[PDB]
Amino acid sequence: KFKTGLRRLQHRVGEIHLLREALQKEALAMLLQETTGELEAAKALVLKRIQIWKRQQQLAGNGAPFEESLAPLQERCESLVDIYSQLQQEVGAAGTRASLTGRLDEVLRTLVTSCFLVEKQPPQVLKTQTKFQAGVRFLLGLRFLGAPAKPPLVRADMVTEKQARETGEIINNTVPLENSIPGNCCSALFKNLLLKKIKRCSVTEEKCAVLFSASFTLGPIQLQALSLPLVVIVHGNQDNNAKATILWDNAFSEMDRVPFVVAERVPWEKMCETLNLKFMAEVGTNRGLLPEHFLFLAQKIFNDNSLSMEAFQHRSVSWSQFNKEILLGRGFTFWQWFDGVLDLTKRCLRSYWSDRLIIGFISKQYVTSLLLNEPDGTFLLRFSDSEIGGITIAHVIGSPQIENIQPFSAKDLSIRSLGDRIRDLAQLKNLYPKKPKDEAFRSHYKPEQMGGRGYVPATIKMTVE
Amino acid sequence: KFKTGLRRLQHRVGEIHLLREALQKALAMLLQETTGELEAAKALVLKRIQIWKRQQQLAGNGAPFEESLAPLQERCESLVDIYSQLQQEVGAAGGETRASLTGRLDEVLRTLVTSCFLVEKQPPQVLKTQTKFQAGVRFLLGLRFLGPAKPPLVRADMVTEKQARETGEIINNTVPLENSIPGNCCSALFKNLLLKKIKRCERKGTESVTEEKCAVLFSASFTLGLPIQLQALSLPLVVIVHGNQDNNAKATILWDNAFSEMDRVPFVVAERVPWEKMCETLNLKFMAEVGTNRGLLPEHFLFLAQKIFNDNSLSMEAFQHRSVSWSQFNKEILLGRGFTFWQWFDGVLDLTKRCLRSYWSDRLIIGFISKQYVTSLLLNEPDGTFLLRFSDSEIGGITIAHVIRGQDGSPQIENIQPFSAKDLSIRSLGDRIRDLAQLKNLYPKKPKDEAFRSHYKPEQMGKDGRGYVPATIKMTVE
DNA sequence: ATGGATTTCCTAGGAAGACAGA
DNA sequence: TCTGTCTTCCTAGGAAATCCAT
Numbered sequence: 001k002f003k004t005g006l007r008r009l010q011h012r013v014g015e016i017h018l019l020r021e022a023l024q025k026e027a028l029a030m031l032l033q034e035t036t037g038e039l040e041a042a043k044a045l046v047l048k049r050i051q052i053w054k055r056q057q058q059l060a061g062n063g064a065p066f067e068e069s070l071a072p073l074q075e076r077c078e079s080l081v082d083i084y085s086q087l088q089q090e091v092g093a094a095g096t097r098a099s100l101t102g103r104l105d106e107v108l109r110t111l112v113t114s115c116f117l118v119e120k121q122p123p124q125v126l127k128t129q130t131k132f133q134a135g136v137r138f139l140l141g142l143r144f145l146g147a148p149a150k151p152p153l154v155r156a157d158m159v160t161e162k163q164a165r166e167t168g169e170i171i172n173n174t175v176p177l178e179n180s181i182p183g184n185c186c187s188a189l190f191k192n193l194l195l196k197k198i199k200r201c202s203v204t205e206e207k208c209a210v211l212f213s214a215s216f217t218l219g220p221i222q223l224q225a226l227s228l229p230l231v232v233i234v235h236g237n238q239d240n241n242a243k244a245t246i247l248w249d250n251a252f253s254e255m256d257r258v259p260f261v262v263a264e265r266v267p268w269e270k271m272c273e274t275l276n277l278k279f280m281a282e283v284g285t286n287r288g289l290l291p292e293h294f295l296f297l298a299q300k301i302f303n304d305n306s307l308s309m310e311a312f313q314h315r316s317v318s319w320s321q322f323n324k325e326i327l328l329g330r331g332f333t334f335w336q337w338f339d340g341v342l343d344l345t346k347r348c349l350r351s352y353w354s355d356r357l358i359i360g361f362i363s364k365q366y367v368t369s370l371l372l373n374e375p376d377g378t379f380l381l382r383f384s385d386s387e388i389g390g391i392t393i394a395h396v397i398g399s400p401q402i403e404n405i406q407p408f409s410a411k412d413l414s415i416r417s418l419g420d421r422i423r424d425l426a427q428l429k430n431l432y433p434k435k436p437k438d439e440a441f442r443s444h445y446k447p448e449q450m451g452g453r454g455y456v457p458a459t460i461k462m463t464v465e
Numbered sequence: 466k467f468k469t470g471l472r473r474l475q476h477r478v479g480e481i482h483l484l485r486e487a488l489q490k491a492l493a494m495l496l497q498e499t500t501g502e503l504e505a506a507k508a509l510v511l512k513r514i515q516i517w518k519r520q521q522q523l524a525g526n527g528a529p530f531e532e533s534l535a536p537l538q539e540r541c542e543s544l545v546d547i548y549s550q551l552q553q554e555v556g557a558a559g560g561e562t563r564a565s566l567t568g569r570l571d572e573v574l575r576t577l578v579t580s581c582f583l584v585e586k587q588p589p590q591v592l593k594t595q596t597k598f599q600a601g602v603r604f605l606l607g608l609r610f611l612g613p614a615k616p617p618l619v620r621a622d623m624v625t626e627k628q629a630r631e632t633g634e635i636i637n638n639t640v641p642l643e644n645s646i647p648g649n650c651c652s653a654l655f656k657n658l659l660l661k662k663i664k665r666c667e668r669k670g671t672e673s674v675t676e677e678k679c680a681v682l683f684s685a686s687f688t689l690g691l692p693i694q695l696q697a698l699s700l701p702l703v704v705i706v707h708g709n710q711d712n713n714a715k716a717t718i719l720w721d722n723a724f725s726e727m728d729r730v731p732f733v734v735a736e737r738v739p740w741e742k743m744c745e746t747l748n749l750k751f752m753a754e755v756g757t758n759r760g761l762l763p764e765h766f767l768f769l770a771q772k773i774f775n776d777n778s779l780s781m782e783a784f785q786h787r788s789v790s791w792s793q794f795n796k797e798i799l800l801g802r803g804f805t806f807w808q809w810f811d812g813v814l815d816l817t818k819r820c821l822r823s824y825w826s827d828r829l830i831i832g833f834i835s836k837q838y839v840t841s842l843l844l845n846e847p848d849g850t851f852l853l854r855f856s857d858s859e860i861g862g863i864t865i866a867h868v869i870r871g872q873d874g875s876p877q878i879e880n881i882q883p884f885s886a887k888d889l890s891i892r893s894l895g896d897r898i899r900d901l902a903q904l905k906n907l908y909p910k911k912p913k914d915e916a917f918r919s920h921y922k923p924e925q926m927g928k929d930g931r932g933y934v935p936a937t938i939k940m941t942v943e
Numbered sequence: 944a945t946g947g948a949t950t951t952c953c954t955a956g957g958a959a960g961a962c963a964g965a
Numbered sequence: 966t967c968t969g970t971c972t973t974c975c976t977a978g979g980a981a982a983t984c985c986a987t
Binding site for chain 4: 949
Binding site: 128200202203234235238 | 948949950951
């Protein structure tokens with residue numbers, strides 16, 4: 001946060017300057033070594049803060065806060081390159097160290113090579129024969145003024161995880177890296193990228209990346225940048241699996257790693273925070289999941305039936321448990337079910353969810369426990385465990401019993417929204433607990449268009465018995 | 466019959482043989498006679514070919530077709546056999562001088578051959594760019610040439626209407642013209658054709674892109690021994706570049722396939738035609754496209770006449786001697802509406818094709834009826850009597866019109882919002898009609914639970930898979 | 944033979960850029 | 966300058982080959 005150290009650096013440059021002008025009528029002039037050392041300190045710090053920005057970008061993909069801007073980083077790097085410039089310029093004196101110029105040049109080169117970033121990441125789930133965009137940024141672009149004034153060219157090529165550790169073809173891969181004096185930025189934006197074909201080398205688990213290469217002239221520096229890991233797909237059906245992989249990699253990944261290694265097993269609450277974040281960001285609400293939801297999720301993925309939330313907390317979940325092992329009694333993985341719920345809730349249940357009308361994540365046994373002691377016509381809404389992306393009405397009605405209504409798909413809710421569907425059922429009197437349905441659903445109801453012209457409108461209603 | 470005519474020519478050939486071997490121990494004018502009878506026969510066969518093409522022309526709109534070329538091929542083969550035997554008998558000197566005899570024989574041969582090159586499988590008459598289509602060309606005298614012989618290759622090229630009177634390019638346009646001993650056929654089949662782009666020819670007032678007629682030209686060369694070039698032209702087709710154009714393109718083709726003379730300058734068609742011709746075309750297209758033999762009735766033709774002509778006349782005989790123009794058909798917007806006559810009609814075709822197909826055949830749908838005649842009919846009928854009519858305001862929709870008298874009983878008519886094909890996909894017409902308690906009788910009196918009992922779908926009881934209770938949706942009106 | 948992955952193929956249709964309009 | 970024609974761009978699925986496996 002403190003640039004004060006920089007104000008120590010340039011001032012030290014001042015000291016060197018005046019000292020040089022003192023010998024204008026051998027000496028030390030040891031301050032150059034000193035100052036250069038503090039420069040390497042500054043550079044290292046800015047480099048690791050860059051790496052921080054990168055991991056923040058990584059987390060942003062799953063649904064987490066991001067800076068997002070690089071302008072401060074750019075200003076810092078610019079200042080460091082400034083002091084570098086005046087130092088190197090000051091080296092020009094009669095007062096002969098190969099180390100001064102040699103070290104300064106490696107400071108410059110590491111700063112430059114690390115200032116080559118992927119500002120706009122390509123899609124982390126990528127379909128072949130579909131067009132996507134990516135954006136690369138150079139922070140020290142306006143410091144090279146341009147002195148050559150001739151733009152380097154950045155090429156983008158697809159690489160496997162193996163080639164990442166140091167085929168498939170992409171089109172319109174060459175774009176010039178250009179300086180923009182307004183906007184203060186040195187960027188290259190690939191806006192018409194397309195993948196013609198890829199070598200596959202469990203399909204939705206192979207991590208690939210886009211490699212942005214360039215050449216930079218001064219006085220021969222090769223610039224390399226690697227995008228976030230991405231999963232290549234060839235049809236929409238694979239998407240639902242691909243996300244999981246990406247979801248796993250964007251979180252749970254250390255800042256420095258061999259591309260692209262990630263833990264096979266992780267703490268359960270880490271997974272809970274990941275699910276909460278992804279849920280809130282993807283659906284688009286600030287009303288996240290609750291501890292009970294995490295409990296009923298926990299039993300679901302673990303095939304357990306404990307009613308104490310803390311036993312699960314010290315459990316660990318593996319990638320296999322997450323998206324490679326089939327749930328008991330069912331035909332899908334945990335993740336597939338969860339993502340199905342994500343889709344349904346995003347498209348048709350966002351207002352309903354934010355209003356807290358949906359209990360959602362509950363075993364129907366806890367539902368029995370709750371509803372059995374309730375008056376006739378009390379109901380609650382639960383996500384269906386049998387099918388993917390479905391929601392079911394559970395209500396209590398000869399004695400007292402409870403009825404589970406066939407789950408609504410996104411299609412079903414598109415035909416008639418959940419709200420008016422609920423309005424249709426007069427047998428439903430109160431939303432759990434003890435809340436009148438006609439108050440908490442007045443906004444979701446749509447006003448009748450009775451009357452023209454010149455036809456009477458025919459409406460569709462849901463009924464069950 | 467035509468075969469008596471064939472064996473008379475051939476018997477004359479026998480006589481020619483015996484006469485020749487008699488005069489080898491002078492006319493011999495009988496050869497001209499026989500030649501005269503051959504050219505007659507050839508002409509007839511040619512005209513029968515011209516018939517087939519026209520049937521094919523009609524077939525594209527939806528009319529019966531009898532598709533094999535094998536009989537025609539048999540005719541042509543026997544005929545060229547006769548040609549060969551005449552030409553062969555000509556080589557007696559002579560007669561013991563006349564070049565003209567063989568000269569006529571050779572034109573018999575060449576006209577027959579060039580006319581034996583047909584487009585058996587027609588390309589789509591509505592053609593989308595960058596979409597794959599197929600075409601099939603046939604040579605009838607193919608199994609005669611060759612019996613050893615290098616098979617020719619047929620080239621397919623796109624041509625405008627102007628070039629037909631004598632321009633995008635196609636991919637994989639070369640295919641060898643091959644003989645097949647089984648099937649007894651000499652055909653060339655283009656199975657991977659593609660139009661990359663098209664350049665649209667003309668000034669376009671008042672025309673529309675989608676009104677411009679193009680064709681595929683099939684060319685070949687034949688090496689016998691003598692230099693005969695084979696060209697065949699397909700039916701006119703309209704090239705499109707997006708689905709929105711289809712419903713208009715079709716109209717053009719519909720107009721062009723009918724109303725076209727058997728021999729014509731490509732591709733001229735009458736701009737105006739008798740109304741009853743239009744009725745026959747509309748009925749045929751309806752039956753073929755929907756897929757029923759239950760065609761239109763005089764009342765339907767009356768309300769259609771009123772619609773397209775803007776004539777509130779109630780006499781079927783007035784319209785009978787009227788003429789309808791292309792402009793009225795698909796270039797003039799209907800009064801009060803945003804679409805042409807044809808667009809509405811095609812909407813109805815689509816609706817009836819996808820849904821209401823069984824319903825129409827059961828004669829449950831009157832369909833083409835003015836709301837005035839509806840009012841006339843329904844006012845007197847009992848409470849809850851209804852009928853189903855196609856919406857004139859909307860495209861591809863059908864509406865229930867029913868009457869409520871009450872105990873007073875002042876009878877008014879209630880017109881229910883038209884059902885789209887989508888709406889019927891959500892819940893069938895049958896189940897929709899069942900859902901409303903009020904509708905008691907189909908017109909005139911037929912009980913609703915009798916005339917729709919086959920169309921009803923069985924209700925599922927709340928048993929559960931599952932275990933769960935099913936929720937179904939029903940239609941209601943208020 | 945069923946079924947589950949994986950991929951090239953096809954298709955309608957929305958959205959929006961490009962093209963004229965005596 | 967604009968509107969309606971025309972066109973190009975682009976894409977979420979549906980039908981269905983290839984191939985593989987305690």
